Paper text:
In bacteria, EF-P plays an important role in overcoming such polyproline sequence-induced ribosome stalling. Additionally, numerous bacteria possess an EF-P paralog called EfpL (also known as YeiP) of unknown function. Here, we functionally and structurally characterize EfpL from Escherichia coli and demonstrate its role in the translational stress response. Bioinformatic analyses based on AlphaFold predictions indicate that EF-P-like proteins have a three-domain structure similar to EF-P, but they only share about 30% sequence similarity.
In the frame of this study, we solve the structure of E. coli EfpL (EfpL) and uncover its role in translation of XP(P)X-containing proteins: Through ribosome profiling, we explore the EfpL arrest motif spectrum and uncover additional sequences beyond the typical polyproline motifs that both EF-P and EfpL can resolve. The EfpL structure reveals a significantly tilted KOW domain relative to the C-terminal di-domain compared to EF-P structures, certainly enabled by the flexible hinge region between the independent moieties. However, a separate alignment of KOW and OB di-domains between E. coli EfpL and for example, the EF-P structure resolved within the E. coli ribosome from Huter et al., reveals low r.m.s.d. values. This suggests the relative domain arrangement is merely a consequence of the unique crystal packing. The structural alignment ultimately revealed a β3Ωβ4 loop elongation by two amino acids for EfpL, different from the canonical seven amino acids in EF-P. In this way, EfpL_R33 remains apical similar to canonical EF-Ps. As shown by the lowest-energy model, the local geometry in principle would allow the unmodified arginine of the EfpL β3Ωβ4 loop to reestablish the interaction with the tRNA trinucleotide. Furthermore, the model suggests EfpL could mediate specific interactions with the RNA as—unlike EF-P_K34—EfpL_R33 was found to stack between the two C-bases and make polar interactions with the phosphate-sugar backbone. Hence, based on the docking model we suggest that the prolonged β3Ωβ4 loop and its central tip R33 are capable of compensating for the lack of a modified lysine. A literature search revealed that E. coli EfpL is acylated at four different lysines (K23, K40, K51, and K57) in the KOW domain.
Numbering used by the authors: 1 to 144, 150 to 188
Write the structure that this text describes.
C-alpha cells in the first residue's frame, strides 16, 4: 500500500483507469498558515502519450505497478511505428510516435547503448534512455565569454551551446536536464 510521499520519477501508477508514468514531482510547501505540503505530479499516460497532472496529500494511498526492464536495440521505423528488439530473446516491442515522442528528441536514427523498455506482465509501457547522448549539430550560427547560442541537433531538438561550436560537430547532452556537457 504505497503512499504519495514515497512516489518517485520513473514509477508507474494505476490511477483512475490509467497507467501513468511519473515524469516529475514538485513538493509544494504550504500555500497558507495551517495548510499541508502537497505533491504535484506530472505524468505521461503510457497508452496515449498524453500528459496528466495530479496533486496529492502526503499520506494519500496510491497503487504502483511492478516494473520489469529489458535492454533493447532500435530495429526500424515504419511511419508512425517504432520497432525495438530485446537484445536477449529477440522479442519485438512496437511503440507509436505518441508514446515515445519525448525520447525521440534524443534518440539518433541508429539508436544508442543502454536503452531499456518498461513492461508490466507482458504489457509494453515506456522507453527508458540512458543519462547522456552524443548528437550532431545540424544548424547553428558560424562558430566564432560564458555565453551560449541556440543549436538544432539531428533529431530536431534545439539546445544552448557555447559560441565557438560549428555545424557538423558532435556534442554530449544530458538528456534529463537538456544541457550541453561538451564535445
Amino acid at each position: 500500500s504505497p503512499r504519495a510521499n514515497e512516489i518517485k520519477k520513473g514509477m508507474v501508477l494505476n490511477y483512475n483507469g490509467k497507467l501513468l508514468l511519473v515524469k516529475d514531482i514538485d513538493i509544494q510547501s504550504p500555500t497558507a498558515r495551517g495548510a499541508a505540503t502537497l505533491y504535484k505530479m506530472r505524468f505521461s499516460d503510457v497508452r496515449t502519450g498524453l500528459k496528466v497532472e495530479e496533486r496529492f496529500k502526503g499520506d494519500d494511498i496510491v497503487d504502483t505497478v511492478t516494473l520489469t526492464r529489458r535492454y533493447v536495440d532500435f530495429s526500424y521505423v515504419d511511419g508512425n511505428e517504432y520497432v525495438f528488439m530485446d537484445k536477449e530473446d529477440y522479442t519485438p516491442y512496437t511503440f507509436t510516435k505518441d508514446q515515445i515522442e519525448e525520447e525521440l528528441l534524443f534518440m539518433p536514427e541508429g539508436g544508442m547503448p543502454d536503452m531499456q523498455v518498461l513492461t508490466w506482465d507482458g504489457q509494453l509501457l515506456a522507453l527508458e534512455l540512458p543519462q547522456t547522448v552524443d548528437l550532431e549539430i545540424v544548424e547553428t550560427a558560424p562558430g566564432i565569454s560564458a555565453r551560449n547560442k541556440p543549436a538544432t541537433l539531428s533529431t530536431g531538438l534545439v539546445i544552448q551551446v557555447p559560441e565557438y561550436l560549428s555545424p557538423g560537430e558532435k556534442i554530449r547532452i544530458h538528456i534529463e536536464e537538456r544541457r550541453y556537457m561538451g564535445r
